[PDB]
Write an enzyme that holds these catalytic residues in place. Structure first.
Site, mmCIF file in Angstrom:
data_model
loop_
_atom_site.group_PDB
_atom_site.id
_atom_site.type_symbol
_atom_site.label_atom_id
_atom_site.label_comp_id
_atom_site.label_asym_id
_atom_site.label_seq_id
_atom_site.Cartn_x
_atom_site.Cartn_y
_atom_site.Cartn_z
ATOM 1 N N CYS A 147 -58.373 39.826 -17.143
ATOM 2 C CA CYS A 147 -57.457 39.222 -16.364
ATOM 3 C C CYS A 147 -57.627 39.684 -14.910
ATOM 4 C CB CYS A 147 -55.893 39.453 -17.042
ATOM 5 S SG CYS A 147 -54.885 38.738 -15.882
ATOM 6 N N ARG B 258 -53.789 41.181 -13.196
ATOM 7 C CA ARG B 258 -53.139 42.477 -13.663
ATOM 8 C C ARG B 258 -52.460 43.263 -12.587
ATOM 9 N NH1 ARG B 258 -57.629 45.485 -16.886
ATOM 10 N NH2 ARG B 258 -59.248 44.101 -15.966
ATOM 11 N N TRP C 31 -49.026 32.749 -13.327
ATOM 12 C CA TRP C 31 -49.245 31.442 -12.483
ATOM 13 C C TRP C 31 -50.668 31.321 -12.213
ATOM 14 C CZ3 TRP C 31 -46.022 35.794 -10.984
ATOM 15 C CH2 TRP C 31 -46.888 36.569 -10.089
ATOM 16 N N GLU D 116 -58.975 27.719 -11.538
ATOM 17 C CA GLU D 116 -58.843 27.502 -12.856
ATOM 18 C C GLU D 116 -58.602 26.010 -13.008
ATOM 19 O OE1 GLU D 116 -56.550 30.237 -15.413
ATOM 20 O OE2 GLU D 116 -55.509 31.049 -13.702
HETATM 21 C C1 HEM Z 1 -49.293 36.475 -12.948
HETATM 22 C C2 HEM Z 1 -50.419 35.890 -12.689
HETATM 23 C C3 HEM Z 1 -51.642 35.869 -13.544
HETATM 24 C C4 HEM Z 1 -52.936 35.536 -12.992
HETATM 25 C C5 HEM Z 1 -53.202 34.960 -11.761
HETATM 26 C C6 HEM Z 1 -53.994 35.408 -14.168
HETATM 27 C C7 HEM Z 1 -55.022 34.933 -14.144
HETATM 28 C C8 HEM Z 1 -56.119 35.127 -15.026
HETATM 29 C C9 HEM Z 1 -57.250 34.400 -15.118
HETATM 30 C C10 HEM Z 1 -57.899 33.298 -13.880
HETATM 31 C C11 HEM Z 1 -58.083 34.506 -16.308
HETATM 32 C C12 HEM Z 1 -59.269 33.763 -16.844
HETATM 33 C C13 HEM Z 1 -58.689 32.663 -17.449
HETATM 34 C C14 HEM Z 1 -59.872 31.665 -18.062
HETATM 35 O O1 HEM Z 1 -60.718 31.263 -17.074
HETATM 36 O O2 HEM Z 1 -59.778 31.334 -19.304
HETATM 37 C C15 HEM Z 1 -57.065 35.476 -17.187
HETATM 38 C C16 HEM Z 1 -57.458 35.842 -18.232
HETATM 39 C C17 HEM Z 1 -56.243 36.565 -19.232
HETATM 40 N N1 HEM Z 1 -55.179 36.806 -18.858
HETATM 41 FE FE1 HEM Z 1 -54.445 36.619 -16.965
HETATM 42 N N2 HEM Z 1 -53.257 36.068 -15.181
HETATM 43 C C18 HEM Z 1 -51.997 36.202 -14.777
HETATM 44 C C19 HEM Z 1 -50.979 36.572 -15.994
HETATM 45 C C20 HEM Z 1 -51.233 36.940 -17.066
HETATM 46 C C21 HEM Z 1 -50.093 37.483 -18.274
HETATM 47 C C22 HEM Z 1 -48.740 37.488 -17.973
HETATM 48 C C23 HEM Z 1 -50.822 37.877 -19.235
HETATM 49 C C24 HEM Z 1 -50.362 38.540 -20.527
HETATM 50 C C25 HEM Z 1 -48.966 38.956 -20.541
HETATM 51 C C26 HEM Z 1 -52.276 37.676 -19.165
HETATM 52 C C27 HEM Z 1 -53.266 38.011 -19.867
HETATM 53 C C28 HEM Z 1 -54.721 37.473 -19.807
HETATM 54 C C29 HEM Z 1 -55.584 37.664 -20.802
HETATM 55 C C30 HEM Z 1 -55.457 38.237 -22.372
HETATM 56 C C31 HEM Z 1 -56.644 37.048 -20.744
HETATM 57 C C32 HEM Z 1 -58.086 37.072 -21.220
HETATM 58 C C33 HEM Z 1 -57.916 35.321 -21.665
HETATM 59 C C34 HEM Z 1 -59.111 35.097 -22.825
HETATM 60 O O3 HEM Z 1 -59.744 36.116 -23.208
HETATM 61 O O4 HEM Z 1 -59.289 33.898 -23.054
HETATM 62 N N3 HEM Z 1 -52.449 37.503 -17.691
HETATM 63 N N4 HEM Z 1 -56.041 36.054 -16.386
HETATM 64 C C1 LIG Z 2 -58.734 30.328 -22.964
HETATM 65 N N1 LIG Z 2 -58.974 31.399 -22.084
HETATM 66 C C2 LIG Z 2 -57.674 31.941 -21.650
HETATM 67 C C3 LIG Z 2 -56.886 31.079 -20.451
HETATM 68 C C4 LIG Z 2 -56.777 29.559 -20.458
HETATM 69 C C5 LIG Z 2 -56.256 29.034 -19.492
HETATM 70 F F1 LIG Z 2 -56.030 27.647 -19.196
HETATM 71 C C6 LIG Z 2 -55.424 29.638 -18.599
HETATM 72 F F2 LIG Z 2 -54.359 29.045 -17.728
HETATM 73 C C7 LIG Z 2 -55.502 30.873 -18.667
HETATM 74 C C8 LIG Z 2 -54.381 31.836 -17.735
HETATM 75 C C9 LIG Z 2 -53.192 32.401 -18.279
HETATM 76 C C10 LIG Z 2 -52.314 33.303 -17.403
HETATM 77 C C11 LIG Z 2 -51.381 33.952 -18.169
HETATM 78 C C12 LIG Z 2 -52.210 32.843 -16.290
HETATM 79 C C13 LIG Z 2 -53.521 32.237 -15.593
HETATM 80 N N2 LIG Z 2 -53.656 32.270 -14.209
HETATM 81 N N3 LIG Z 2 -54.492 31.761 -16.546
HETATM 82 C C14 LIG Z 2 -55.878 31.733 -19.736
#
Ligand code: HEM
Ligand code: A1A0B
Ligand code: HEM
Ligand code: A1A0B
Ligand code: H4B
Ligand code: H4B
Ligand code: ZN
Lengths: 413, 420
Positions: free
Chosen positions: B118, B121, B290, B295
């Site tokens: 993420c 974070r 958000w 994305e």
């Molecule tokens: C608040 C603004 C946030 C932003 C800008 C953000 C951004 C991102 C992005 C761009 C990714 C890659 C997503 C992808 O391409 O699949 C990601 C992955 C991830 N985020 Fe964040 N996120 C946010 C909030 C959160 C929150 C609230 C959580 C959990 C409570 C979280 C947990 C995770 C996890 C576990 C992944 C790994 C996803 C995966 O392994 O498929 N994020 N995040």
């Molecule tokens: C399958 N990979 C994970 C995954 C797929 C999505 F389509 C998402 F949008 C996000 C995601 C989630 C959060 C909490 C914030 C953010 N900015 N992106 C993550």
């Protein structure tokens, strides 16, 4: 044990068996991953026997002569030298096979589909910097081929005791000078400031301009390196212009046409070749994204966007992105017009995926470094982005090595 | 080892990582082979997939209670030692235990803090936790999800939230959101061979129509929720639309862009992951934040297997499309991400571009090394899908390791569901 990699764009899956045959470390541990660390972490007679045996075994296997009379004789012959001389010599065939496979095993290289067409210039008879200058000049003239670039490597005498190393002090053969100004600004290439300083110090009379071709600085047999000016008629250059924007030529940019790495170390059978300049041709993004646009380098984004009438106030306008694209159009279109070989990041990546399928089919694997293979712009719209890649280190290999100015101890009083 | 340094090749800043010493489970890597770009490198899980024995479950519990009281300046206190004995008795009589409400919020904020993939974070301690463990039905799951969606959307001023349903017990009573995200568009296979809508969701849309969803059959049909409670057959529910914030995409210069006819949704809400704390596994835990612009604009719009709108846009830009060298994909891809960002901002809907977001992650990284001795990171995932090297993170070394509490992958339930 087998291992599977997936392409998430195509669902294709390949089975890496070849990873079993690697020896030195990747950096990673069972519990920590070092896949983004740039650099992670003289052999006795006893050290050198099993390495050499590994390579001779591998060579005779490659040519379907394993366990033959010609194989088992060579093995005995290599032991005779390591017993006698405490080292040994590669036959010419082995040194060509070795140089080609060290390129094949370069996991950070997206251009490896071409590996088997490598021109190996045997220079192990060289004894002086003048000798090195001559060999390198002929390498450059050959590889440049009037804009029609050809892959080549020129290999100088292997290591002996580490006190008598052949070295090319240049990081690449053709590079531009950097000079830091009294006011703090930097003219030319800010990366080569330190190296420009050594050159100047050793004798060089700098033009003090924005695209001065550095002299070669060459070390033979452990002696103080010596300066040489590559004849200009052999340095092929491309002046950069954009097909849409007239104003682009007035930015005054050019680049060299021949990418030639000279700071690395070629390891074949336990032998180390500390001066092995190799070269191919350019991928578009190397100049257009990294050379020109990195904040540590020529850093022309502001200059360009300004001439684009771009709102450079807030980042969300993506002015930097918009300008970067145009600049790499300039680089490709410029090279293509002067008929200088080059490959755009799309073409290059599509080729690599084919090479990778191919390699998993005949060779059983292909060590790749995702962090390096993915272009440094438009990553997700190239196919390698969606390609899982296993990273391991096979030998022969190209290796990093200390910068010779940090290690050399000077003769001249 | 003893201390691993990471370095930023654009500022020569070096950071010294000790946090990795407290890493519990495998990365997939060995000293002889690196798996940093395998999507699922490992199957090392801290407990068997079903109801575990005392010596299997207690030590993980002891591990987490110990870390929690440590986190709040205790360890050894009366409340900590009474807790340890409470988890002992509770396992000794129900084969699981229950987390205090303080405990549940701690683990949730830390699973986010530990989420090496993420980039977002830097906000981890500003999470909103909705405890939904009193839930018992798909209908209750729908009520809880609906409130989550409304709280998090906040009329476009997005807020980060997670809603936590009851922990897995024996595995056959799993709670599951069958949607990957709470709000995703539908995927329709066409009689010729093409695809209408989002092709990632075709297999899901099938299950929904198969379950009786009446598909409106457009390009941006918000999908129903398929909610499964306590192991029982999942249940369709339509999210009331006045809750699904959507942004129509226009372009600040190309006025013809509004006619591509695209919109996205404002709320990224991941609902298929498994949140693990003290050996407990919350199989249903939708969480939302958000979007980063890329994305939607890079991945959603421009992957081949996604909406694939690249050539349709490049046409309207009148681009040299004969060969790649003209960088027509590169050129359109930028205009698209400008369009998305401009639309979200013009509708006062929270969004963050890749430059701002990556810079912030560099700051987060410092903050974490200063106070924690490290910050786990997955470079492959943190670097944005376009313009990598012009962002700060591309030039920053990162160490990747698995801290607990964590968010884990888990199989799509329809692969492993015994229907009733
Ligand atoms: C608040 C603004 C946030 C932003 C800008 C953000 C951004 C991102 C992005 C761009 C990714 C890659 C997503 C992808 O391409 O699949 C990601 C992955 C991830 N985020 Fe964040 N996120 C946010 C909030 C959160 C929150 C609230 C959580 C959990 C409570 C979280 C947990 C995770 C996890 C576990 C992944 C790994 C996803 C995966 O392994 O498929 N994020 N995040
Ligand atoms: C399958 N990979 C994970 C995954 C797929 C999505 F389509 C998402 F949008 C996000 C995601 C989630 C959060 C909490 C914030 C953010 N900015 N992106 C993550
Ligand atoms: C023929 C066309 C070639 C192309 C298009 C090509 C392309 C590339 C590119 C773009 C990189 C990334 C380098 C960077 O960004 O710093 C790279 C790395 C590398 N290439 Fe190739 N290359 C070619 C030829 C060769 C040859 C002939 C050799 C060896 C004899 C070679 C060996 C390597 C090695 C060792 C690296 C790693 C550089 C490092 O680790 O710093 N390449 N290649
Ligand atoms: C210090 N980084 C390594 C490095 C830096 C460069 F500038 C390069 F150009 C290449 C390179 C090398 C070859 C043989 C072809 C090609 N296209 N690029 C490699
Ligand atoms: C093979 C590769 O690891 C895979 O395609 C990953 C790369 N990095 C990624 N990073 C993000 N943020 N999202 C992704 O889907 C992926 N895909
Ligand atoms: C820290 C990180 O490993 C570093 O920025 C790498 C990433 N990948 C790269 N890839 C290429 N081709 N060239 C580079 O200089 C780098 N730099
Ligand atoms: Zn690794």
């Amino acid at each position: 044990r087998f291992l599977k990699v997936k392409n998430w764009e195509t669902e294709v899956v390949l089975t890496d068996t070849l990873h079993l045959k690697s020896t030195l470390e990747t950096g990673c541990t069972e519990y920590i991953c070092m896949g983004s660390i740039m650099h992670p972490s003289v052999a006795t007679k006893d050290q050198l026997f099993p390495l050499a045996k590994e390579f001779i075994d591998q060579y005779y296997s490659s040519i379907k002569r394993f366990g033959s009379k010609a194989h088992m004789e060579r093995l005995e012959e290599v032991n005779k030298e390591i017993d006698t001389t405490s080292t040994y010599q590669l036959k010419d065939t082995e040194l060509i096979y070795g140089a080609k496979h060290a390129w094949r095993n370069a996991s950070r290289c997206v251009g490896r589909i071409q590996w088997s067409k490598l021109q190996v210039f045997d220079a192990r008879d060289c004894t002086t910097a003048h000798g090195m200058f001559n060999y390198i000049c002929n390498h450059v003239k050959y590889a440049t081929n009037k804009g029609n670039l050809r892959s080549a490597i020129t290999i100088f005498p292997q290591r002996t005791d580490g006190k008598h190393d052949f070295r090319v002090w240049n990081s690449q053969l053709i590079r531009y000078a950097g000079y830091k100004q009294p006011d703090g600004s930097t003219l030319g290439d800010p990366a080569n400031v330190q190296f420009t300083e050594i050159c100047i110090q050793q004798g060089w009379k700098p033009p003090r301009g924005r695209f001065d071709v550095l002299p070669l600085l060459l070390q033979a047999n452990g002696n103080d390196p010596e300066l040489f000016q590559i004849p200009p008629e052999l340095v092929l250059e491309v002046p950069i212009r954009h097909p849409k924007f007239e104003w682009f030529k007035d930015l005054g940019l050019k680049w060299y046409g021949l990418p030639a790495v000279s700071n690395m170390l070629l390891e074949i059978g336990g032998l180390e070749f500390s001066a092995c300049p190799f070269s191919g041709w350019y991928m578009g993004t190397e100049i257009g994204v990294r050379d020109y646009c990195d904040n540590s380098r020529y850093n022309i984004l502001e200059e360009v966007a300004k001439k684009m009438n771009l709102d450079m106030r807030k980042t969300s306008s993506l002015w930097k992105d918009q300008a970067l694209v145009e600049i790499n159009i300039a680089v490709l279109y410029s090279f293509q017009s002067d008929k200088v070989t080059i490959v755009d990041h799309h073409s290059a990546t599509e080729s690599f995926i084919k090479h990778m399928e191919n390699e998993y089919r005949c060779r059983g694997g292909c060590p790749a470094d995702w962090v390096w293979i993915v272009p440094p712009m438009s990553g997700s719209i190239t196919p390698v982005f969606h390609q899982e890649m296993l990273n391991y280190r096979l030998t022969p290999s190209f290796e990093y090595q200390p910068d010779p100015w940090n290690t050399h101890v000077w003769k001249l009083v």
